[PDB]
Structure 1
Amino acid sequence: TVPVKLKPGMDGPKVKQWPLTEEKIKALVEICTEMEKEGKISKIGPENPYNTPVFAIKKKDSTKWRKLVDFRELNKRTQDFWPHPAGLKKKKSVTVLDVGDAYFSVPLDEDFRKYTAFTIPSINNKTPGIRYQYNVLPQGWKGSPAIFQSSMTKILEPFRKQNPDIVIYQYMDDLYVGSDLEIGQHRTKIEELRQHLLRWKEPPFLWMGYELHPDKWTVQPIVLPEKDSWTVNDIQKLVGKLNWASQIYPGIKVRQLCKLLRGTKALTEVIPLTEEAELELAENREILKEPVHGVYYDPSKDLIAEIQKQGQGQWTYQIYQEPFKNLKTGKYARTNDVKQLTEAVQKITTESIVIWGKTPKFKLPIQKETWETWWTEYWQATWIPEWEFVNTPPLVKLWYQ
């Protein structure tokens, strides 16, 4: 075992466990009971005041339940350990494998074990609740991938030289297999990995066992309404929106459009567009065709992901580090509100992982209680991004589409 430690001065996590349903509890009991039999975890006593929250999530294309431990706090408190394939994103197709189980074959520094304490609650506080701590490397812990990196290199050694055409990236419990090969010839080189990985309980496919096609991941420019006739209202919305995007693309001008709108006219009054104006619009259109220049990814800054609901099962997001300085922008479409929002968050996380190798910080448009209550019902990732809850304004949403 490796002597792991928490960042200096820091003590262990003592996170409150969010109430669970009798269904997710029964699941966690059956699961943890078995992990105990195989010595992966052990019951603990009152002398351990630490706690990390746990959940049970469903596995896609499987009838079994997965134990999801929210090691987010512990991971911020775990010491730093001392490379990302700029090419993984370039690849045409990538499959995601859940290799979390690889860890269960490695002991955890005895003196760190206490920090991995978790509780399986009881309905209505009938009983005190079952407490455990880890003996092996826990799936989801920042330290596991690191403390297993070596044994992992030693294992991805042959396939790496055998197929130096397919780039393999590991992130926490996930393994990202990228290639350009044909879907069949690809899915086949994947199964050849699943057999070479089993060679050392098979690593299932996350995300439907499907690919991602990182190439298609597009940036969604700002769009302007293309109309026949333009009413005073249409123009007013045009200027407001332009004014806003002017903050980003300084070449945007509206001076000529603000002219069509002098005086106090009727919102519905149709206004022909003067020559000068029509040209200024066409120009603003040209300017918005591509993302603003000079926006780079700072590896030393946090990635922020903001989502807005468009309605009709349509959402929009933006990943940046500095306001307006978007690194990416996308959209997502159909379920119910929450299910969609969760499917979105995971999608944006997978991409953010693939493109930069780090999960972003989400700003979710939902009440914490509502989120806390339903997210585990549709969540399928093995990781959990950090998140906060907000109240998006009418205008920002109104300036995307």
Structure 2
Amino acid sequence: ETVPVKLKPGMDGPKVKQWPLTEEKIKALVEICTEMEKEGKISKIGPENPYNTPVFAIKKKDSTKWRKLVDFRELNKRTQDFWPHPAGLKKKKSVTVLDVGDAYFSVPLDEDFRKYTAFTIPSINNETPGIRYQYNVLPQGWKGSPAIFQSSMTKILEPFRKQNPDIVIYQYMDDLYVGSDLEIGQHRTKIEELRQHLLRWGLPPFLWMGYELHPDKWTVQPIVLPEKDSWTVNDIQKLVGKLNWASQIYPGIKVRQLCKLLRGTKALTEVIPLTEEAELELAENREILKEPVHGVYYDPSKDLIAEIQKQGQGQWTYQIYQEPFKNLKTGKYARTNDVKQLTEAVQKITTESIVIWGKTPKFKLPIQKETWETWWTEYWQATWIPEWEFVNTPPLVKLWY
């Protein structure tokens, strides 16, 4: 019995190009797929399937085993909607993340949809056709899998849910977020209870090192002003620049007094004593920045955007908003290499977007696509893949964070 699924009206299947892979990853992919084949989860396909979705091999944390990762991003987009988020979960002390992707492997996929799950294990130097497949069961990473498996999933959970009502359990794509406030020792032990309680039904690894997220401790990185002993013409100028910028957000910011210290083409290094008027204006400016701008609410119907700035020395900055300057959250991230770090960050920020809103944000990466497409899979560990576009971080925006 398979739920007849369909693509959004008029839409066709995806025909996404497959990014070149390293022999290693290809090998991993062959071993894996070949087994999924014996187990009848996938099946080879013929030339009559013009569709394609990119695959990748990523690495399991604390495991020598690889993990097939299919970028069903396009497919999920052309996939019909299906007809919630526990605000409470973000408040728990500890959230652990589990990989329940294997749940799906035991649920057939509507025969007619199967052609759309087509993917290809490429070959080096094009010496061979390239191995083609499509899914028979619910494919991990497809937006349809959680839905269809929803029912069966709720069943499986209701006992634990009632047994441990102090625990919050959220499912997202192939991940399960288990939250609570118990002492760390207890948290880790009640999780394992669930693990085996999942085994009890059918085939659950610990995502993210099997370590805990502590959403409780997540906090917004407000804008900050240089607090210094003596203030030079330069200091002030930068100071005024930044303030001026921040003014568009917090319009309560005044510069009048500071800009007055800046009359006359003085020398960048000449030290300027601050007139009390200005001294107090700064102070007010400072207090105004102490917290995020009021009136910024999360709109569930708008895309959640995430931008990252490279700060150097292993330091990065990000911001999550839907409408320019109306940040819903802003954070930092410190260490590796540019890319490794950057990916870890993306993932850090994604996980949060989920935990907090239940939706993955759409990133804007300060990197050259060719590069990203090259190493990103080397450090990626999540089971999902956010939407992303590549950009050129302005010189100043970075200075302002």
Q: Does TM-score exceed 0.5, indicating one fold?
A: yes
Tell whether the 8 Å contact from 1:168 to 1:177 is kept in structure 2 after alignment. yes
Between the aligned partners of 2:203 and 2:229, the Cα distance in structure 1 is 59
Tell whether the 8 Å contact from 1:142 to 1:172 is kept in structure 2 after alignment. yes
- Other structure's SS at 1:257 match: helix
Aligned-pair distance for 1:78?
0.5
In structure 1, what is the equivalent of residue 152 of structure 2? Answer: 151
Tell whether the 8 Å contact from 2:169 to 2:177 is kept in structure 1 after alignment. yes
Between the aligned partners of 2:334 and 2:197, the Cα distance in structure 1 is 37
Aligned-pair distance for 1:363?
0.2
Aligned-pair distance for 1:272?
0.4
Tell whether the 8 Å contact from 2:103 to 2:202 is kept in structure 1 after alignment. no
Instruction: Write the deviation string for residues 223-246 of structure 1: whole angstroms up to 9, x where unpaired.
Output: 000000000000000000000000
Between the aligned partners of 2:124 and 2:292, the Cα distance in structure 1 is 52
Between the aligned partners of 1:226 and 1:208, the Cα distance in structure 2 is 39
Aligned-pair distance for 1:280?
0.4
Instruction: Write the deviation string for residues 126-169 of structure 1: whole angstroms up to 9, x where unpaired.
Output: 00000000000000000000000000001001000000000000
Between the aligned partners of 2:203 and 2:349, the Cα distance in structure 1 is 27
Aligned-pair distance for 1:201?
8.3
Gaps of 5+ in 1: none
Between the aligned partners of 1:395 and 1:185, the Cα distance in structure 2 is 47
In structure 2, what is the equivalent of residue 176 of structure 1? Answer: 177
- Other structure's SS at 1:226 match: coil
Tell whether the 8 Å contact from 1:260 to 1:271 is kept in structure 2 after alignment. yes
- Other structure's SS at 2:8 match: coil
Aligned-pair distance for 1:354?
0.3
Tell whether the 8 Å contact from 2:254 to 2:281 is kept in structure 1 after alignment. yes
Between the aligned partners of 1:124 and 1:54, the Cα distance in structure 2 is 18
- Other structure's SS at 1:328 match: strand
In structure 2, what is the equivalent of residue 29 of structure 1? Answer: 30
Between the aligned partners of 1:11 and 1:83, the Cα distance in structure 2 is 28
Aligned-pair distance for 1:366?
0.3
Instruction: Write the deviation string for residues 194-213 of structure 1: whole angstroms up to 9, x where unpaired.
Output: 01000018700001101101
Between the aligned partners of 1:375 and 1:154, the Cα distance in structure 2 is 37
Aligned-pair distance for 1:65?
0.2
Aligned-pair distance for 1:352?
0.4
Aligned-pair distance for 1:300?
0.5
- Other structure's SS at 1:330 match: strand
- Other structure's SS at 1:347 match: helix
Tell whether the 8 Å contact from 2:236 to 2:258 is kept in structure 1 after alignment. yes
Q: Which aligned runs of 4 or more in structure 1 are off by greater than 4 angstroms?
A: none
Instruction: Write the deviation string for residues 266-293 of structure 1: whole angstroms up to 9, x where unpaired.
Output: 0000000001010000110000000000
User: Structure 1 length normalisation: TM-score?
Assistant: 0.99
User: Structure 2 length normalisation: TM-score?
Assistant: 0.99
Tell whether the 8 Å contact from 1:194 to 1:202 is kept in structure 2 after alignment. no
Between the aligned partners of 1:346 and 1:42, the Cα distance in structure 2 is 31
Tell whether the 8 Å contact from 2:317 to 2:331 is kept in structure 1 after alignment. yes
Gaps of 5+ in 2: none
Between the aligned partners of 1:111 and 1:314, the Cα distance in structure 2 is 48
Instruction: Write the deviation string for residues 49-81 of structure 1: whole angstroms up to 9, x where unpaired.
Output: 000000000000011000000000000000000
Between the aligned partners of 1:13 and 1:224, the Cα distance in structure 2 is 49
Tell whether the 8 Å contact from 1:13 to 1:115 is kept in structure 2 after alignment. yes
Tell whether the 8 Å contact from 2:319 to 2:327 is kept in structure 1 after alignment. yes
Q: Does 1:340 align with 2:348?
A: no
Between the aligned partners of 2:91 and 2:186, the Cα distance in structure 1 is 19
Tell whether the 8 Å contact from 1:171 to 1:357 is kept in structure 2 after alignment. yes
Tell whether the 8 Å contact from 2:103 to 2:203 is kept in structure 1 after alignment. no
In structure 1, what is the equivalent of residue 40 of structure 2? Answer: 39
Between the aligned partners of 2:209 and 2:36, the Cα distance in structure 1 is 26
Between the aligned partners of 1:241 and 1:201, the Cα distance in structure 2 is 56
Tell whether the 8 Å contact from 1:93 to 1:214 is kept in structure 2 after alignment. yes
Aligned-pair distance for 1:88?
0.3
Between the aligned partners of 2:65 and 2:38, the Cα distance in structure 1 is 18
Instruction: Write the deviation string for residues 238-263 of structure 1: whole angstroms up to 9, x where unpaired.
Output: 00000000000011000000000001
- Other structure's SS at 1:227 match: coil
- Other structure's SS at 1:293 match: coil
Between the aligned partners of 1:368 and 1:343, the Cα distance in structure 2 is 17
Aligned-pair distance for 1:325?
0.2
- Other structure's SS at 1:151 match: helix
Between the aligned partners of 1:186 and 1:379, the Cα distance in structure 2 is 26
Between the aligned partners of 1:381 and 1:171, the Cα distance in structure 2 is 12
Between the aligned partners of 2:203 and 2:239, the Cα distance in structure 1 is 55
Give the length in aligned residue pairs: 400
Tell whether the 8 Å contact from 2:306 to 2:361 is kept in structure 1 after alignment. yes
Between the aligned partners of 2:118 and 2:395, the Cα distance in structure 1 is 43
Between the aligned partners of 1:104 and 1:59, the Cα distance in structure 2 is 18
What is the RMSD of the two structures over their aligned residues, measured on CA atoms?
0.6
**Identical counterparts, % of pairs:** 99
In structure 2, what is the equivalent of residue 358 of structure 1? Answer: 359
